[PDB]
């Protein structure tokens, strides 16, 4: 019969067998890491599937621990009486295909007894969706009430709705576009270059070598983190202030740092301790090939042809997925009644920070379901 | 007698002696590279000083040629009948202190016969103004009719106007802010890190070693280039198209590149062949140190106290020095009657591309200097 759902901090590892990718290549022996909160209803029709973003994982809520290097990335969104109210809904989240937090990816051991590494194939967002759908099938779940996500999570949710409109009752698509843009591919390809030019990248087969491309991954994360924040907030929070230490300001003209510089350095250092460079490359490449129109006659035809009820949200200060992209989605999707604009200074990261606004968008989506 | 001004493509190398910087550090034996166009008046009062931006040089107009690895970066702005009309004005431009196109910088040889390299002291925008003023004095010039610049050049022009209001009759401050911002220091410090973490940076003393931090400088330039362009521009020009070469389209599902990726790579590759990594770091740190308010009671006090008439311009699509920064400049400077908005898809780089718009701003400025 079906595999049982885990609960809470517990990760279930769901084998889905060999999978055929959009490219026609095959990945053998794929395992999908899954977490869940709330009881699955008898008819298995109350699932809210949460698609995590580029550097997040299946741990949507909960504490950090030996199984969870980071705490929940959407704290308070899932729980009793929360937006995803676990008294009524069953929240489910996977780690994306190509990830490094339990699902098969570059750090995983392959059949030949060596890390996947450079042998891990290129994947698309559609491959990621179909791996999640396959995992749900192994859990006995053949439809979802809603699929929700922001950023790369929004790309997954959008493709899911377009690919499986008869198996989704509603979707939340937050802070993403219908396809990768020139600016996105520009910065993302530069981040990949920072990793791959690091001497310890070793062609991507550094796993188990004792060395890793930490300097390159650190730089890649710093590049990305700026794209995730708002321009004004960076100037009001940091401006050109020096870093303030316990007993006073540093001197940026000597050995000291600017406050924004110290902030970015700390973000980069923490990230390298928590994330795999090869996964970062695979997942960033999947974002570069995000395109809901591919094989479907273009973006307009694909979106106009999707009947799923959809809440589309965008953020005023988002510099990576600017509001014009969500205006396009909201216009073209016939199941979207109009763009929801999140007013926030926090840039793209507002979808993680603006608790009340995001809760309202999630509640609206589940009401549609 | 005062040193003679050069003309046209000719570079003059003006010694100004040893200089003490704002930090207290010293640079021995500073030499400033200078170019000039047009005749200096008998009163020596018709100089229009052009401040170049981060990766530009003294060669404001003219072709690439035997002595100029790049052609003029503001072609058509200087000449007979042009916006800087050499029938009336004497245009002068230096290579900035810390640069790598003729003026003393980290590639220059120090008194021990090795490049300054890691010994080159960090400079501020104010140091760069003081060095240009010192070079002008060696050329017999103690005042300028106008000082003009965009981007880093705008920071130099703004500081010059605030520092020497008695010796400037007008300024053009284009596509810059009153101080470095959080986002600017963020991206600039990351560009510096790309260079300094390169395995061949060697603390900045890579010269003559057989290894150089070209890969890191290439990455730094790609990061910067994105900040210089417009978001919509990049999506309309490249979108997610694959690169097309002589033999057809590349395939990003395998080893091929996207068109925007190939564009950035090519920009980086060309750049590393004609710019020095240590100079890039020094000049980028000078931008981190830009702050017209320092030692003057803050930005608002410094700007409100500047009596120079100023044309402030900003670009609608600029992502590095967004329009809100020029709105602040235009509001606080009493010599600005209102922001001039340049409509362009090209982002920050519009100040180099939008010739008609920039020509108009330069003409407006020089009319205020008369
Ligand atoms: K619609
Ligand atoms: K004013």
Residue numbers in the entry:
A (entry chain B): 10 to 378
B (entry chain A): 10 to 379
What text appears in the publication on this structure?
MetX (previously mis-annotated as MetA in the reference genome of M. tuberculosis) is an l-homoserine O-acetyltransferase, commonly also referred to as a homoserine transacetylase (HTA) and is a crucial enzyme in the biosynthesis of methionine and threonine. Here we report the structures of three homologous MetX enzymes from Mycobacterium tuberculosis (MtMetX), Mycolicibacterium abscessus (MaMetX), and Mycolicibacterium hassiacum (MhMetX) and compare them to previously solved structures of HTAs in order to begin development of selective inhibitors of MtMetX via a structure-based approach. Two copies of each monomer exist in the asymmetric unit of all three structures. MetX can be divided into two distinct structural domains, the catalytic domain, and the lid domain. The organization of the catalytic domains’ fold marks MetX as members of the α/β-hydrolase super-family.
The three solved MetX structures include residues 15–70, 77–372 from MhMetX, 10–379 from MaMetX, and 7–372 from MtMetX. The catalytic domain comprises residues 15–181, 297–372 of MhMetX, residues 17–183, 304–379 of MaMetX and residues 17–181, 311–372 of MtMetX. For MtHTA and MhHTA, Ser157, Asp320, and His350 comprise the active site; MaHTA’s triad is comprised of Ser160, Asp327, His357. MtMetX and MsHTA both contain a small helical region (αL1′); MaHTA features a unique pair of short anti-parallel sheets (β1′, β2′). Temperature factors of the equivalent rings in MhMetX is B = 19 Å2, while both MtMetX and MaMetX are B = 21 Å2, values very similar to the HiHTA structure with B = 16 Å2. MaMetX shows a similar pattern with the top clusters appearing nearly overtop those of MtMetX with S = 26, S = 13 and S = 10. M. abscessus MetX was initially chosen for study due to its high similarity to the Mtb variant. However, the structure and CS data argue that it might make an excellent secondary target for drug development. M. abscessus is an emerging public-health threat, primarily implicated in pulmonary infections.
